[PDB]
Structure formats: C-alpha cells, structure tokens
Amino acid sequence: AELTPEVLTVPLNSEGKTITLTEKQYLEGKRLFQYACASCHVGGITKTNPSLDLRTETLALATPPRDNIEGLVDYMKNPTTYDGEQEIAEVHPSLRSADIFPKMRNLTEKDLVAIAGHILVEPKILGDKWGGGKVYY
Amino acid sequence: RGWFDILDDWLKRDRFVFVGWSGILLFPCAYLALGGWLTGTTFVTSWYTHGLASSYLEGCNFLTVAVSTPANSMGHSLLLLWGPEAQGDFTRWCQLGGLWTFIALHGAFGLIGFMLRQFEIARLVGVRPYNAIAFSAPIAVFVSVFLIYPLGQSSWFFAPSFGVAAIFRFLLFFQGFHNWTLNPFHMMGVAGVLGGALLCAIHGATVENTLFQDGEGASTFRAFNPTQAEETYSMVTANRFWSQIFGIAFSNKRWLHFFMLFVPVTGLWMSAIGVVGLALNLRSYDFISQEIRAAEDPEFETFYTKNLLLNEGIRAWMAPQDQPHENFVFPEEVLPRGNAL
Amino acid sequence: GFAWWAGNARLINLSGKLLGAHVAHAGLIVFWAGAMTLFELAHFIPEKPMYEQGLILIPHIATLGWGVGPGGEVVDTFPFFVVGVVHLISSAVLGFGGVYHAIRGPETLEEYSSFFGYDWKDKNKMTTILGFHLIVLGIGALLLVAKAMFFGGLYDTWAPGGGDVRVITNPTLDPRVIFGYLLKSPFGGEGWIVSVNNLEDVVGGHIWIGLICIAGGIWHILTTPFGWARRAFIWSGEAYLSYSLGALSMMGFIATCFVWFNNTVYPSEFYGPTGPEASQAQAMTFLIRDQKLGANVGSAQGPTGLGKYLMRSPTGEIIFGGETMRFWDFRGPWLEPLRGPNGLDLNKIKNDIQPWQERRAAEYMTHAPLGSLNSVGGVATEINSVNFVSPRSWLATSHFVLAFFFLVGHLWHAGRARAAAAGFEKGIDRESEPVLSMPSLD
Amino acid sequence: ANLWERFCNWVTSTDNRLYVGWFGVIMIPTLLAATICFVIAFIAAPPVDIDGIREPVSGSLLYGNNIITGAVVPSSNAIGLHFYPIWEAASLDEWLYNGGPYQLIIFHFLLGASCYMGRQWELSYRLGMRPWICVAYSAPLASAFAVFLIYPIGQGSFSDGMPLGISGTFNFMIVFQAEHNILMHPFHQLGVAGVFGGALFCAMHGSLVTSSLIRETTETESANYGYKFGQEEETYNIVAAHGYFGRLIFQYASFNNSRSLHFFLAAWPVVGVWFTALGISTMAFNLNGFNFNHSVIDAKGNVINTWADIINRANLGMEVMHERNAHNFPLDLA
Amino acid sequence: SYPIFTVRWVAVHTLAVPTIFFLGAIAAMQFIQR
Amino acid sequence: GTTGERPFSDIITSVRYWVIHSITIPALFIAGWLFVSTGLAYDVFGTPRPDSYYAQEQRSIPLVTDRFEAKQQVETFLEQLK
Amino acid sequence: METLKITVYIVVTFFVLLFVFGFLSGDPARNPKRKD
Numbered sequence A: 001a002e003l004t005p006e007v008l009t010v011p012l013n014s015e016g017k018t019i020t021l022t023e024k025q026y027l028e029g030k031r032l033f034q035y036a037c038a039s040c041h042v043g044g045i046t047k048t049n050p051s052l053d054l055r056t057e058t059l060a061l062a063t064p065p066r067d068n069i070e071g072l073v074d075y076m077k078n079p080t081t082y083d084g085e086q087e088i089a090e091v092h093p094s095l096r097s098a099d100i101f102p103k104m105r106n107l108t109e110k111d112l113v114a115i116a117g118h119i120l121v122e123p124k125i126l127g128d129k130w131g132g133g134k135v136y137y
Numbered sequence B: 001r002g003w004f005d006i007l008d009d010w011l012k013r014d015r016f017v018f019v020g021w022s023g024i025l026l027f028p029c030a031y032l033a034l035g036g037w038l039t040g041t042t043f044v045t046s047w048y049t050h051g052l053a054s055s056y057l058e059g060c061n062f063l064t065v066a067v068s069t070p071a072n073s074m075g076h077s078l079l080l081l082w083g084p085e086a087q088g089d090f091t092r093w094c095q096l097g098g099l100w101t102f103i104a105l106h107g108a109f110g111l112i113g114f115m116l117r118q119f120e121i122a123r124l125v126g127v128r129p130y131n132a133i134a135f136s137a138p139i140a141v142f143v144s145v146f147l148i149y150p151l152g153q154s155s156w157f158f159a160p161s162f163g164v165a166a167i168f169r170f171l172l173f174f175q176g177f178h179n180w181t182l183n184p185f186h187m188m189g190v191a192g193v194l195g196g197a198l199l200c201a202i203h204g205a206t207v208e209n210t211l212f213q214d215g216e217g218a219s220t221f222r223a224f225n226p227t228q229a230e231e232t233y234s235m236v237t238a239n240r241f242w243s244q245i246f247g248i249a250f251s252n253k254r255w256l257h258f259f260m261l262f263v264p265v266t267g268l269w270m271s272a273i274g275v276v277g278l279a280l281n282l283r284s285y286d287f288i289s290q291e292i293r294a295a296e297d298p299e300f301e302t303f304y305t306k307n308l309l310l311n312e313g314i315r316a317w318m319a320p321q322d323q324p325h326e327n328f329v330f331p332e333e334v335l336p337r338g339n340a341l
Numbered sequence C: 001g002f003a004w005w006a007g008n009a010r011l012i013n014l015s016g017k018l019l020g021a022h023v024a025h026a027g028l029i030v031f032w033a034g035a036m037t038l039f040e041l042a043h044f045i046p047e048k049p050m051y052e053q054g055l056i057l058i059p060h061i062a063t064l065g066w067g068v069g070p071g072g073e074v075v076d077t078f079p080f081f082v083v084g085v086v087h088l089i090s091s092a093v094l095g096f097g098g099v100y101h102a103i104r105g106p107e108t109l110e111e112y113s114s115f116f117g118y119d120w121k122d123k124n125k126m127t128t129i130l131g132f133h134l135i136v137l138g139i140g141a142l143l144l145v146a147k148a149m150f151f152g153g154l155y156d157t158w159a160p161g162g163g164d165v166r167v168i169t170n171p172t173l174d175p176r177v178i179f180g181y182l183l184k185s186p187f188g189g190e191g192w193i194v195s196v197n198n199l200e201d202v203v204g205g206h207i208w209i210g211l212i213c214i215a216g217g218i219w220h221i222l223t224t225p226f227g228w229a230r231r232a233f234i235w236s237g238e239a240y241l242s243y244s245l246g247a248l249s250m251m252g253f254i255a256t257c258f259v260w261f262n263n264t265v266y267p268s269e270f271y272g273p274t275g276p277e278a279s280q281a282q283a284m285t286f287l288i289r290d291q292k293l294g295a296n297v298g299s300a301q302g303p304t305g306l307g308k309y310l311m312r313s314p315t316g317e318i319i320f321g322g323e324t325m326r327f328w329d330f331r332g333p334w335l336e337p338l339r340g341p342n343g344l345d346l347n348k349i350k351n352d353i354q355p356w357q358e359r360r361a362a363e364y365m366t367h368a369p370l371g372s373l374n375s376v377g378g379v380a381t382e383i384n385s386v387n388f389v390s391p392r393s394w395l396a397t398s399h400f401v402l403a404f405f406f407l408v409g410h411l412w413h414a415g416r417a418r419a420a421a422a423g424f425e426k427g428i429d430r431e432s433e434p435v436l437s438m439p440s441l442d
Numbered sequence D: 001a002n003l004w005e006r007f008c009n010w011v012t013s014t015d016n017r018l019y020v021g022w023f024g025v026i027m028i029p030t031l032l033a034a035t036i037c038f039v040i041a042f043i044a045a046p047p048v049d050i051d052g053i054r055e056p057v058s059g060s061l062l063y064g065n066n067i068i069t070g071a072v073v074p075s076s077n078a079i080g081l082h083f084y085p086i087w088e089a090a091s092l093d094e095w096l097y098n099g100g101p102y103q104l105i106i107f108h109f110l111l112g113a114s115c116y117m118g119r120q121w122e123l124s125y126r127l128g129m130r131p132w133i134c135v136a137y138s139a140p141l142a143s144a145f146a147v148f149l150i151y152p153i154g155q156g157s158f159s160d161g162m163p164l165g166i167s168g169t170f171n172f173m174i175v176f177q178a179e180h181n182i183l184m185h186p187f188h189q190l191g192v193a194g195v196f197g198g199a200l201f202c203a204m205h206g207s208l209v210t211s212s213l214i215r216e217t218t219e220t221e222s223a224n225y226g227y228k229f230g231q232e233e234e235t236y237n238i239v240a241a242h243g244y245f246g247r248l249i250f251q252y253a254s255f256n257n258s259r260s261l262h263f264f265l266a267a268w269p270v271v272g273v274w275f276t277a278l279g280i281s282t283m284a285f286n287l288n289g290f291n292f293n294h295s296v297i298d299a300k301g302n303v304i305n306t307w308a309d310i311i312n313r314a315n316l317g318m319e320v321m322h323e324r325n326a327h328n329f330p331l332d333l334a
Numbered sequence E: 001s002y003p004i005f006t007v008r009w010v011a012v013h014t015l016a017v018p019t020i021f022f023l024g025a026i027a028a029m030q031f032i033q034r
Numbered sequence F: 001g002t003t004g005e006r007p008f009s010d011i012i013t014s015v016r017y018w019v020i021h022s023i024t025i026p027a028l029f030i031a032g033w034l035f036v037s038t039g040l041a042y043d044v045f046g047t048p049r050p051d052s053y054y055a056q057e058q059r060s061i062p063l064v065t066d067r068f069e070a071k072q073q074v075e076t077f078l079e080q081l082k
Numbered sequence G: 001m002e003t004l005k006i007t008v009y010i011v012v013t014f015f016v017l018l019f020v021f022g023f024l025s026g027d028p029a030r031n032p033k034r035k036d
C-alpha cells in the first residue's frame, strides 16, 4: 500500500469541494503537527481533555464543522469550544494567541493548510488508532 | 595403521583450532545455527507467521530483530526445506518460518557437538570431565525451553523467538499466563544464578585481596608464574577474614571450587524442570486458600491478589496481537482496566 | 612499578608533570563549557521553550539574568555567545600551559622553586595550598553575590508577573535562617538545603560561604594541623585524592536532588517542570476542566471515598487528590496564589483561577520529566511522536551516575592509601603473615 | 590500663570471634533493630494502606499470608517521602496502619549494610590484607539503596519502594516494567549479562579447577580430603587446566595468570551489577528504556508491528491494572 | 617458513567473508526510505 | 607455545596482506551493498517491500492459517497486491 | 511518645559519638605493620 492521491484528497470546505495534497505537504503537515500540536494531541487524542479528539467524525460534529481544511485553518486562527459558543484563543494555541503561544509565531498560511491536511489524512491511513488512544497502540 | 587411525591422527592434531571427531558434528551445526540467525535477522520477515517485521532490511534494530517462530498452523512440523510445507522452495521456506526449526535443530546438535568436544579434549589432555558435566545445565535449559515447552503446547509458535525483544516478550508471556515468578523451580533457578554471580565476585575479590607479595610492583599481576608450586594468595588469611566478617568461611579449596560448579549448575537444572511443567500448563499459578478467602471477603488483599490483576491485564491487552491466529476481538468495554488508566 | 593502565599514578611524585595534567584537564572542562554553549546557541530557537530543545547550559546562563526578560522570554542571545566564546578562547591558554608543563616544563618543581614545589607529606605546605584555593573559592561565591546585587540581578521565577530579572537589595544575613537550612531534615516537606525557595536566601548564603571560605583559607595558610588531626588522617597524595572524591560524591548526590526538586535556582521556565510540579499540574488541569463543566470539586467523592480533586494531607492541609497526594509539599509560582492558610482555598479555586494558570498547568502536565533513552517523550507505553526528555531527567541521572562512581573511587583510593601507608598494598609478606602470629579463633 | 583505651582495644580486637570494629558499633544495633522489627511485622503486623487510598493490604502470616505472599508493606503514599518515626504517630495503631515499620526497617538496614561494607574495609586493614573486598560488596549494596531509597526519592514516595516480601518483590518488578520498560534499558541488559556471566564463569572456574585436581586420594574418599587447610602447594594444576581450556576454544582466549583470572571473576559481575543498580537509580528520574513503539511504518503510513510493539501491549496491561483504584486522572506521572 | 592455507585460515575466512558482505548490505539499508 | 601457524600480528602488519585485502574487503562490502540496492535481497528471501505489506484498502494481516496449503496461501496473498 | 523520642535521640547520639571518637583514637596506628 502507498500514499496514493486518493488518500491525499481531503475536503476543502463544507460545500464538498476537495483538494489533493502532495506527499510533500503531508510530511510537512506531520512535521509541523509534531512541532506545535503533538505535546497535547499525539495520536489524535487530547491529553488535557480526552473527551474531544481529532477523529474526522468528531470534527464533523463540531460547530463550525471542522472536518475540512477551511474549518481547521480557521480553528488555528480563532479556536472555539466544540459548540462554537466561546473563543478559547487564551487557553488554546492559535495565531490569535501567538503572543502567549510563541511556537505559533512563525507559522505561515501554507503551514496551516499542511497541518490541517495531516490531521484529515492520518485517520485514513491509521483508522481506529487515530484518536483511539492506548487501546489501539 | 588403517584409514580410521590416520583420520584420527589428523582430527586430533594440535592446531590453533582443535577439530577432533566431535568437530565433525560441532562445527557444521554451530556455524549453521549462527548463520541462520544472522541471515534471518538481517533479511527475513515474520509478516506471514506473526504479522511482525523482524529484520534489519525491514527497519528493525539490534534489539527488535528476531528469527521468529513458525505460524501456529504448522503445529510441530519439523519444517524441513524439502518437506511438504515449503516443498523445496527456499523463499516460502523462509516465509513460513523454516529458519526457526533450522536454527533450533542445528543449534541442538551443535550443543551436543560442543559437549562431546569437552569430553574429547578432556580425555586427550588427561583431565577429569567436569567442565563437560557442568555444561549439562545449559543443555537442559535449551532443550526444555526451546523444545520440550513448545512440544507440550499447540505448536512451535509459542516457543521463544531468537531475538532480544522477542525474548523479552517471552518473559512477559510467562508472567501473565503462567505466573512463572510464583514457581519454586524458577525460584531455585534465581537462587542458583544470583548465587553463582555472588560466588564469582566474592571469590575473585577474595583472591585478589589476600595476595602474597611476590614481586615489587604496584601491579600485582606480574608476580604470578603459572608453573609455581606455591599458592598465590593466603587461604588462611582469607578464612580468618570471612570467619570474623560473616561467621563462617571456606577452609577447603577443593570444596570451594566444587561448590562454584554445584550452585549455578543445579539452579539451571531446577528451572528446566519447572519449564517442563509449564509445557503442560502445569503452573504454580494460584494458592487455593488465598482465592477461597478473597472470593468471600472483599476486604482481603495481598501482593498475591494484586499480581494476578496485573497478569489478567497482560493476557487481555497482549493476546490479540501476540496470538493473531486466534482472531481475538476484545471490544473496549471488555478490557480490564482500573480507574482512569 | 605501575602498568600502563595505571599510568597516571606514575605522576604522584612528579609535581611538574602533574601540574601539567591538572591544567590541561582544566582546559578540557573550559573547552567543553565553551564549545557546548555555542552548540546549544547554534541550535537554539527562541520560539520554543528551552526545555523542548535539549539545553542544559543556556538555562544556567539565563538563570543568572543574562539574555532574558519577563517570563523567561529570551530577548538577547548575545550574552550566551560571549560566555561560550570566552570559555572557548580561555581553554587554549590552559591547554597551552597544560601541555607545556606536562611535556616540556621541569618534571619536578621543588628544585626550581621552593614556593611551587611541595611534598605530599608536608602538612604545612599542603594546608597552604588548600588555603589559597579556599580563598579563590570564597572569591567565586562573592562574584555570584556581586552579580545579584551590583550587576543586573538574577532571574526570579517568583517575581510577581510571571518572573523577571530582579536586583537583590536585601540578601538574608540572619544566621538562624541561613544555617537553619543546614539543620532541616532531608525528608519530605523539609528538604534540607534543597528547599531554598527565594533569592534573598540564596545570595545571603553565598555572602556567608564566601566569608567562611576566605576566613578558612587564611586560617589554613597561618596554621599547621593539630596533633589530633595529625593522628586521624593518612597524609599522602592518594589519601587526599580519596578525601576529595568522597566530597565530590556527596556533592554530586546533592546536585541530583537539587535539579530534581528545586524550581527556584533551576526555574521550571528554563529547565521544565519538576516531577512533583508536573503531577500537581495534572490534577490542577482536570480540576479546571471539570469545574468549568459544572462539577463541585470540593464535594466530589472519588472511588476510594477520598476526594476526587481535593483531600487532606496527614496534617490537615487541603491538597490535590489522586496519586499526587504524595507531592503536596510542592510549591510553585503558578500554584501559590490559590493557597490559603489551610492549604488550597476552595473559594479561590472557584473564583480566581486565571487563564495564565490554566495555560501553565497544561504546559507542565504535557512536559512532565518522563521519557525514553532515545528521547521519546511521555510514559513508557506512549507511541513515538514527541521528541522530549526533560533536562531535569538528563541532569539528575547523569549526576547520580557520576556521584556513585566517585563514591566507588573514594573507597578504592581510601582503602589503597591506608594499605600503602601501612606497607601491605602489594600483598602479604609470606615470612611475616599477620594471621599466622595470631591465635586461632576457636 | 586506661578505660577508653581498653575499650578501643576490644572494639578493634582481631581476637573476637566476630570482628566488631568502629563500623560494627553502628552496624550491630541498627541491624538488630531492623531484624527484630522485620520478624515481628512479618508474623503479626496488621494490614497497611500502602497506596494511601484507605485500601489496606495484608502482609503478615497471622492475617492470612504464607511465606511466599507475605511482606512488610511499604509506607502510605499519603506520607510520601515524609519521615515517619514511631513518635510522630498519635499511637502504634496509627503507625501500623500507615506503614511505619517499613521505614524503621529500611533506614536501620541501609545504615547497617553501609557499615557492613565499612566493616569489610576495616578488618582487612587490621589483618594486613588488601582493601578492595568492600568494593565488591558495593555492587549489591548500591542495588538495595536503589530499590529502597533512590527510586522512592525520584518517584516521591516510599510507597513505590520495594516491598520486603517475595510476592511484593514481583509486584515491584512488574510495575517497574510498565512504568519504565526496564527490559529495553541497556543498564538492565548489562545487569543480566553481569549475572548470567557471573554464573557462567562461576561454573567454568569451579569446573576447570575441579577438573585438574591432583590425585591425592583413593576412590573411597572424597577428593576434598586431598587438600589440607593452609598447605603451601597449589592443589590443582593450572597448566593442565589452561591446556584444556585453551584447546576447547583457542589458546589466547584462556588465562594462565591466576591473578588476572580471579580479577576477571571479581570484576565482571561487580561491574554488571553496578550498571543495573545505576539503571534503577536513573529510571528513578524517569529516563526510561528504549521506546520503539510504532517505529516501523510502511509506505502508506500503516504501523508495522515489531516485537517491541508486542512488549508494549503487555506493558499496557500492567499499566492499566496496577493500583486499580488509585488514579483519577489520565496519566500516571509518578 | 609458514603455511598460508590452514584450518585456521578456513575458520577465519568462514566468518570474515560473510561478515563484511553482511555489513555492506546493512549499510545500504540505512538509505532505504519508505 | 605455538602450533606453527603464522602469527596474526605478523600477517596484518605485512604488506602482501594489505595488498590482497584492500581489494577483497571493499569488494565484499560493495557486493553486500549491491545485494540490497538492486532489490535482490527482497526477492530471494520473500521480505515485503515497504509498499507491499498490505494492499491499498486492506488492514488484515496475510497470516498463514493452513499447514499443507500454506505455500499456496502466501502466493494468494501476494497476487492480491498485483 | 516523647519519652521514646528522647530515649532514641540519646541512644543514637551515644553510638555516633563512640564511632567518631573511636576513629579519632589513632586508628591508622591499629594495623599489624607500620604503626603511626
């Protein structure tokens, strides 16, 4: 098996437009996910709040839907709680809060797309392991 | 003065590496066991027998490579290259696990070879055959663990796999399934191995710190000559030291050195016996009286009950991936887990 | 009579060549200090906490007030470069004197100069060298005072508003405080000297130590050992080596516990959270999460009957629940605002927890000093992903190992010095074996 | 005739059936205290709340244990690293509930064992021996320090030190594997090589010497009677033994210097056991065994399990089950 | 006058020849990418 | 003392020795190297290549479940990648 | 409990003084060869 374009194809937005990443974008996303996110989100879980994970199906049910590149890029700019009711930039890394989360300072717009793409690809590669936690190690 | 005696003449010539009649068995078999291991750990997968990568070629390191056991579905097949499983195909032989039987069986005849060599050289040089006798413990361990144990089980699949991490998995399997730490035959083995290392260290340290001044150098190694008659350290002073320090000491150099043979050899033999029991699942798993009390009395708790909870965790969390032929599917809700973890 | 593998023992009575070994080796220490700093600098990325980057030297420099501002943010990397370059440059000078005295200089010194030459058995001369070095050491501890009080201050993690560099204007001199630490128990809630938690006490302690070392130094230049000391000790080079190995061992073990428990002179901003800190931060984190969802964390009973979030310590203080009950002696700047007189204050917990505290707890919980030898971060069952081992784990383990071996070296060289001084280090004389002139035990 | 000097003469006398010495003046009372308290507690101590969760564990014989399951149980996690002498308890009842005896025994024992090592130095000096037997003993001594004191200091609680019992020991070593992956740690691997090798070389050396004993006896008597205590002549023939072992392997892999040989015997296990004590001592600060969990993945990114991932499944089952009531939050951080 | 080809010669080369070859195969492996 | 073979320290400080072995040692190293770089090692031993542990939309192990049909089973799995 | 505490302080002090004073009472000289 291999990293075919089919797997690198993920939704761009809620309107079911798609976008096909490069193997390059995906490895860059993975690298950037380990840099800025995995201390909390290793394997697609959330160490500081295990009830919310990065499984596509969970993101799909977030308000603003987050199972797409746009939702996730926006999330990395202006994160909200899962129902969209409050902004959590002050306790969650984001470009909006890069004064207090300095790893976010040097992230470009293209980097955000790669991170979002990584998050959306990985459960296609890993299945239940992505966000499933230690049961699946 | 016929051919047999001439060949004897030649096999027993004094050379850098002695050959002997035993060499005919030993050297082929040792070299093949060892080449099979190096070959398999460098190039051969365990994908079809175990669902595991296991060679340098696949991305493993020295701790995780292994020559892994055949699939459970092979039973105790000898898995000869020309046998009905591989049907002479070398590649499929490798993929079905044929290198495991190859190494195990050539390894066993090499071990015989090696002990015959200790007998052969002992006889030519004119000494008593105790080194050979002692090596019976390594042989007992090897056959009981790599041969007798999987023969009582369902297949070679549950033998140890030849690899560093693979042997670690075998340690943990035996804890979780057999409660082998509770087995008094393992406990006597532990005492013999740890008793051996103690005796090794304490005997070396004693000789080196009761040396006779036999030279003038600060390096005391020069002041020994292998053909001197005289003892090179004081048994009298050594005996006094230990008598005053520990209560009792050795006083007989012969008993001392026999006991150093006796202690680790006996311990290894004892552990071999308990593994023979585990071949049959004849475990020292439980204490009945403890279980009766705990079943009736939920405030009763010992380190013994605490360890079985750990065993039960080991079994359920490792069995699906460690025994893939069984198709265990444990939904999340059935996994034993304490709070939070 | 020594073999090649004991070949430096050939130097015991070659004071010139032995001076060269000591000074060449002094140059390697300084070389490493310099080279390593520049290596860390060339790798340093200021957007990343120091402790996500494998730094052990830059944290020592920043702790001293150089390079950093409020919150431990790095503002200026030039001070680090300077410290590296100067150490690097200085090691060539020690290198130079080292190999000159080891290869070319006079191999013995006592014919060339009665001041620099010494005999190990010369007790007056030995205490004089000891005295000089005691003064040097006292000067050095006063340089730390000078920095704190007259040349910019020190980093103070406890400073209000996230920590900052602070000039120390009232160093503690009260000896009931300073020597009070020496007499605290090393057990939990006490911590002997590892519990020093404020820079006033740190600086004042160094005024005392500097004055004591200078006074001690002058004392040893002017005196020779009293007869009771003359009869207590072995007076030989190897014996003095053995004394100092023991002292290095003691100090290595203390340094181990310092970097593991102390978050004042090893701020968690640079070194990462301590083990107790990280574990306290986990309970804090989930107290916050759960209270935000509506949980009444004070009244929530856990599985055992003890509080799920909050319980009492054995002396009554309100503390975090779960296994971290064991770490309730922990104190840190992010946590102290919640402490009232009876321990954690339930009304501050409900009303006054700040976003920066929530951030800090989350950060410290996810950077606990747990990791594998190949630097996979987190518990031992964690998958690969995070490349992190805490600097505190690195600094604790390394110095435990070194302290252990220096204790072995102490016993090695001490027992040998005793034996060599009595004349039986090379073995038992066959013609005068002491046990053969003793009566049998039974 | 001076009283102090007479007492000094008796303390350090080489005529006492057991050497006392200055190290013995501390070792004798501390070891007697630790022994007397250990025996009493093993037989009769009531259950101890080791993990601080008011879930007491029964360690003693009279409360339903046998020799294998019995233990003096470590002190309560509620105590942590706090000093808990008898006089800090409101009563013996309290002190027993909370695990006080464990502290008394291990502190007294570690002190007495430390002095045991010094006593080994001291008598060597009074007898005019070389001094380094005690250095050999520092290997087992460092190992007991590691599991009774160092590992507790790093994890923050004497409740995670090694129980003083047979099944308690196994509990400690299973939980250590789940929390540190000790088997994948190279210092434990050197310890196994130190202990395996020590047993190997013990047997080797014993068998080579036994093999080359010089006929001094008949077949009706134990050969051990061919050696008389304090005879000057060696009792075996090292050249015949070197000539056998050099041929079993090859010549230059065999010792004919008996001094080098016995030094090798001393140094191999001692050094291996130094390392494994250092392993426990450094896993005390959570620098754990190699982690190759999911280190092999395929061209797509599928995880390709290895024997290390199988180890990890076993480690997980230990992790999730141990101290099953004691964790409220998702990471076992200590 | 020493011989060149001996039983020793064979023991040595019986191990050294495959070792170097195996070291070459294993060094190539460090450059395999997934 | 000796059994009449030429001492090793004489052999490896000798010029003829290194004349032969500066060729034989690198050649062997390069041979083993080519064994892997050509892919031949994979095909000889049957070791999966990184792209052939699974098929694209498969996550089952291709585990041998039969003793006497086992060779046929492996071949079946291998076809399911082609 | 205080009677106990004080008793133990005294016992321990007594033994530690024996130890310190014993090793200060010319211990290098208590060997069988060169006494000084």
Ligand code: CLA
Binding pocket: B024, B025, B028, B029, B032, B078, B079, B080, B081, B082, B098, B101, B102, B103, B105, B106, B109
């Ligand atoms: C002393 C050396 C020695 C020993 C003891 C063994 C032992 C073994 N080998 Mg190993 N092997 C060796 C050398 C040795 N091998 C060498 C040198 C090589 C390299 C060529 C190999 C390569 C090798 C492979 C590739 C395999 C083995 C296998 C085996 C096993 C099965 C052997 C078998 O069934 O033989 C059957 C044959 C005999 C027992 C010989 C009996 C002959 C008798 C004395 C005479 C009978 C009459 C004769 C046939 C008349 C001729 C008739 C003709 C004119 C028509 C066994 C453990 C197999 C294995 O490990 O399975 C896992 C396997 O696949 N070996």
Ligand code: CLA
Binding pocket: C004, C005, C006, C007, C008, C009, C241, C245, C405, C406, C407, C408, C409, C410, C412, C413, C416
């Ligand atoms: C301030 C520290 C110090 C000093 C100055 C000395 C000085 C001395 N020692 Mg002591 N020693 C020390 C600490 C010290 N030691 C410690 C901590 C120990 C315990 C480990 C010892 C144990 C010890 C023993 C056992 C002996 C001495 C001896 C000696 C003398 C000869 C030493 C020699 O030639 O080494 C020469 C150097 C070597 C042989 C090299 C050793 C290499 C080490 C073991 C490995 C280091 C590898 C490193 C960890 C990483 C490598 C990475 C890789 C790329 C290479 C000399 C007076 C001898 C003696 O009694 O003299 C009278 C002797 O027999 N030493």
Ligand code: CLA
Binding pocket: C003, C004, C005, C006, C007, C008, C009, C010, C011, C014, C017, C018, C020, C021, C022, C024, C025, C092, C093, C094, C095, C096, C099, C102, C103
């Ligand atoms: C920190 C490490 C250290 C240091 C500083 C020393 C220093 C010394 N050793 Mg020891 N030694 C060491 C490690 C060390 N040793 C170890 C690890 C071993 C075991 C292998 C030994 C074994 C050993 C033996 C066996 C002996 C010594 C001896 C000596 C002394 C004389 C050596 C001599 O004549 O050199 C001669 C060597 C040369 C002329 C070759 C060149 C050496 C130079 C110094 C290299 C430096 C290069 C450097 C890059 C230049 C920078 C210069 C620039 C700053 C201007 C010297 C003081 C000897 C002694 O005690 O004499 C009585 C002696 O016999 N040593």
Ligand code: CLA
Binding pocket: C019, C023, C093, C094, C096, C097, C098, C100, C101, C105, C106, C109, C112, C113, C116
């Ligand atoms: C503690 C280390 C040490 C010690 C004890 C000695 C001792 C000695 N050296 Mg050596 N030397 C050393 C280090 C040391 N040196 C270093 C580091 C170098 C290279 C710079 C040299 C280079 C050297 C040479 C080239 C020669 C000596 C010679 C001598 C002898 C006489 C020197 C004299 O007359 O004083 C001279 C006194 C002064 C110049 C007074 C000024 C005070 C100093 C230089 C400034 C203070 C430095 C400060 C305290 C620390 C550094 C600062 C830094 C932390 C930033 C004497 C035995 C001579 C010899 O052996 O000939 C037979 C000789 O020719 N030395």
Ligand code: CLA
Binding pocket: C127, C130, C134, C182, C183, C212, C213, C214, C215, C216, C217, C219, C220, C223, C224, C225, C226, C229, C232
């Ligand atoms: C590197 C430091 C150093 C060294 C090696 C020495 C070495 C020496 N000193 Mg000097 N000393 C120093 C620093 C040092 N001194 C300083 C800074 C001062 C000024 C305060 C002095 C003041 C001083 C005086 C006033 C005297 C000495 C004397 C001596 C000699 C006997 C020492 C002795 O037996 O102590 C061993 C210690 C004892 C026998 C009893 C005290 C034991 C301590 C308190 C127990 C604590 C153990 C505990 C576990 C450690 C934890 C900390 C503790 C506070 C709780 C010896 C040559 C004596 C001498 O002959 O001078 C000419 C003497 O009378 N020293």
Ligand SMILES: CC1=C(/C=C/C(C)=C/C=C/C(C)=C/C=C/C=C(C)/C=C/C=C(C)/C=C/C2=C(C)CCCC2(C)C)C(C)(C)CCC1
Binding pocket: B031, B032, B034, B035, B036, B037, B038, B039, E014, E015, E018, E019, E020, E022, E023
């Ligand atoms: C199986 C088989 C066979 C056989 C084969 C062989 C016999 C092989 C061999 C092979 C070989 C024979 C191999 C080898 C290899 C080797 C190697 C691979 C090595 C390596 C090593 C190393 C790596 C080391 C290193 C080191 C270190 C690490 C440290 C210490 C030091 C040193 C340097 C040593 C046959 C044909 C019969 C057929 C069937 C199958």
Ligand SMILES: CC1=C(/C=C/C(C)=C/C=C/C(C)=C/C=C/C=C(C)/C=C/C=C(C)/C=C/C2=C(C)CCCC2(C)C)C(C)(C)CCC1
Binding pocket: C177, C178, C179, C181, C182, C193, C196, C201, C202, C203, C204, C205, C206, C208, C209, C232, G019, G020, G021, G023, G024
């Ligand atoms: C800086 C600082 C500080 C302070 C400190 C100090 C002030 C210290 C001191 C300390 C000291 C003050 C030390 C001590 C020491 C001591 C010791 C360590 C001793 C030892 C002893 C010995 C070793 C002895 C021995 C002997 C005997 C017993 C008998 C006879 C013989 C002899 C002599 C051998 C503080 C914390 C505040 C804070 C931070 C900083």
Ligand SMILES: CCCCCCCCCCCCCCCCCC(=O)O
Binding pocket: B081, B082, B083, B087, B088, B089
């Ligand atoms: C006692 C010594 C026994 C020596 C055993 C060596 C065996 C030599 C290996 C020969 C393997 C050839 C098998 C491949 C061809 C099989 C084809 C078929 O099954 O019809």
Ligand code: OEX
Binding pocket: C323, D051, D155, D159, D160, D175, D179, D322, D323, D326, D332, D333, D334
């Ligand atoms: O205590 Mn004994 O054991 Ca070391 O972690 Mn946390 O804590 Mn408890 O759990 Mn896992």
Ligand SMILES: [Cl-]
Binding pocket: B306, D171, D175, D321, D322, D323, D324
């Ligand atoms: Cl448990």
Ligand SMILES: [Cl-]
Binding pocket: C321, C322, C323, C324, D326, D327, D328, D329
């Ligand atoms: Cl918890």
Ligand SMILES: [Fe+2]
Binding pocket: B203, B257, D205, D209, D262
């Ligand atoms: Fe011996």
